[PDB]
Amino acid sequence: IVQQQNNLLRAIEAQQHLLQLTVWGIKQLQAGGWMEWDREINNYTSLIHSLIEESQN
Amino acid sequence: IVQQQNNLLRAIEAQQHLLQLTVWGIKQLQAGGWMEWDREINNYTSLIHSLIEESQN
Amino acid sequence: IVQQQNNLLRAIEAQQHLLQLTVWGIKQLQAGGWMEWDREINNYTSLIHSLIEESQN
Numbered sequence: 001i002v003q004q005q006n007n008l009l010r011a012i013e014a015q016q017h018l019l020q021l022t023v024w025g026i027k028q029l030q031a032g033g034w035m036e037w038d039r040e041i042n043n044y045t046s047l048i049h050s051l052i053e054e055s056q057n
Numbered sequence: 058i059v060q061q062q063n064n065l066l067r068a069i070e071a072q073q074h075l076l077q078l079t080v081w082g083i084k085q086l087q088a089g090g091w092m093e094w095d096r097e098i099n100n101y102t103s104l105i106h107s108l109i110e111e112s113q114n
Numbered sequence: 115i116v117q118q119q120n121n122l123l124r125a126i127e128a129q130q131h132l133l134q135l136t137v138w139g140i141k142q143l144q145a146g147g148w149m150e151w152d153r154e155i156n157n158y159t160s161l162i163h164s165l166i167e168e169s170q171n
Binding site: 001004005007008010011012014015017018019021022024025026029 | 115116119122123126129130133136137140143144148151154155158159161162165166168169
């Protein structure tokens with residue numbers, strides 16, 4: 001079960017990289033009315049980083 | 058292992074919020090040929106909500 | 115705990131489908147300077163597929 005929990009964390013980490021690439025792609029396409037979307041992307045990005053670092057530890 | 062499973066669920070929840078923000082961003086940029094993409098986004102969004110609520114319970 | 119690990123894997127699988135739909139949506143909007151973004155999307159997509167198949171097994 002330990003090995004499976006490590007697998008799932010590595011999957012979540014790799015999905016977060018993919019998510020960050022899609023956020024970056026959307027910002028390149030939008031580049032102004034997006035301030036609240038940027039606030040929420042930033043807050044949830046920081047939130048997920050904290051949870052991943054907690055899980056890694 | 059219980060604490061780790063809670064960590065991973067909170068990470069998946071925070072990633073789902075980020076995913077929903079990226080879907081919303083893409084819909085704002087597209088705003089017509091997207092009907093099947095919308096069907097699939099809706100079905101998988103409902104699917105993930107059901108799995109998160111199951112996991113929370 | 116086994117049932118919970120299966121729940122979380124199914125959630126990660128459903129999120130990967132959603133992620134792939136958002137990548138596809140972004141590529142339709144961009145359709146040229148995106149070569150490195152495509153390389154990284156491909157590498158992380160392959161990485162996550164390997165981790166999901168490992169977890170399923």
